[PDB]
Amino acid sequence: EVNSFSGYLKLTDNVYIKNADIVEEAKKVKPTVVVNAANVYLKHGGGVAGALNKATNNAMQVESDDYIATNGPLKVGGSCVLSGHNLAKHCLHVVGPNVNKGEDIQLLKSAYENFNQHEVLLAPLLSAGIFGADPIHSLRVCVDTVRTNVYLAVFDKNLYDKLVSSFLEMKSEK
Ligand SMILES: Nc1ncnc2c1ncn2[C@@H]1O[C@H](COP(=O)(O)OP(=O)(O)OC[C@H]2O[C@@H](O)[C@H](O)[C@@H]2O)[C@@H](O)[C@H]1O
Ligand code: NA
């Protein structure tokens, strides 16, 4: 039974959020697509990318190395679909801007646009961790950009509560 999401809070007609770890969710939900928050060389570091890769026993990194050897690096805001291995049917690797290095935060719109090629996705908040974007800003861009069904896994309970509170204020406009 694929895409068996449960316990999400509905934010908009197509964006849902849950205080959960993205790997544990993938194991529970068996999603068609899980989203990786990637860099342009698909060298999977210490955030979601490392978590997903470790859960595939490094199969994600070997596949990514093979992709890069054939195709070269991605562009910021770009994506590629590879295997989801034991976690999902497919993994959508998306490159958000690295705001810590001064890349353009507006490319987060381009990054989330990639979600619109998939009916339903399990995803993290792009650029909001190692890449240093404000998590509330990443959620705002997600809500304004994605039209397909996005289930957001936010593992930190304090961040989750902060995101919901900030989302409500922006939506009500006070
Ligand atoms: N296991 C997890 N489950 C859910 N959310 C998570 C998890 N780990 C981190 N997060 C949260 O998801 C958001 C995404 O953070 P990152 O994974 O660091 O993604 P990003 O900010 O885009 O940085 C990308 C960079 O990090 C490396 O892992 C990756 O190879 C790339 O270079 C952050 O809010 C982070 O706290
Ligand atoms: Na929750």
Author numbering: 206 to 379
Structure paper excerpt:
In Coronaviridae, including the betacoronavirus SARS-CoV-2, the causative agent of the COVID-19 pandemic, the macrodomain is part of non-structural protein 3 (nsp3), a 200 kDa multidomain protein encoded as part of open reading frame 1 (ORF1). Evolutionarily, these viral macrodomains fall within the MacroD-type class, which is primarily composed of (ADP-ribosyl)hydrolases that are able to cleave the protein-ADPr bond. To this end, we obtained the crystal structure of the S2-MacroD bound to ADP-ribose and its analogues ADP-HPD and ADP-HPM (characterized as potent inhibitors of the related poly(ADP-ribosyl)glycohydrolase (PARG) enzyme). We identified and characterized the structural basis for the observed functional diversification of MacroD-like enzymes and provide for the first time direct evidence for the hydrolysis of PARP14-ADP-ribosylated substrates. These data suggest that SARS-CoV-2 contains a conserved, enzymatically active macrodomain that can potentially counter the host antiviral ADP-ribosylation process catalysed by PARP14, as well as alter poly(ADP-ribose) (PAR) signalling, thereby enabling viruses to escape the innate immune response of the host.
In order to identify how sequence alterations affect the structure and substrate recognition of S2-MacroD, we solved its protein structure in the presence of the reaction product ADP-ribose (ADPr) by X-ray crystallography. S2-MacroD2:ADPr crystallized in P212121 with two ligand-bound molecules in the asymmetric unit and was refined to a resolution of 1.57 Å. The resulting structure of S2-MacroD:ADPr follows the previously observed fold of a tightly packed α/β/α sandwich with a central six-stranded, mixed β-sheet flanked by six α-helices. The ADPr ligand lies within a deep cleft on the crest of the domain. The two protomers deviate only slightly from each other (r.m.s.d. of 0.091 Å over 149 Cα). The adenosine moiety lies parallel to the protein surface and is partially shielded by Phe360, which interacts edge-to-face with the aromatic ring system. The amino group at the C6 position is interacting with Asp226. The phosphodiester is interacting with several backbone amide groups within a loop region spanning the edge of the binding cleft (Ser332 to Phe336), which was therefore termed the pyrophosphate binding loop. Two characteristic motifs contribute further to the coordination of the distal ribose, first, the NAAN motif (Asn241 to Asn244 in S2-MacroD) lines the floor of the binding cleft and Asn244 coordinates both the 2″ and 3″OH moieties of the distal ribose. Second, a triple glycine stretch makes further contacts to the 1″ and 2″OH positions via the backbone amide group of Gly252 and Gly250, respectively.
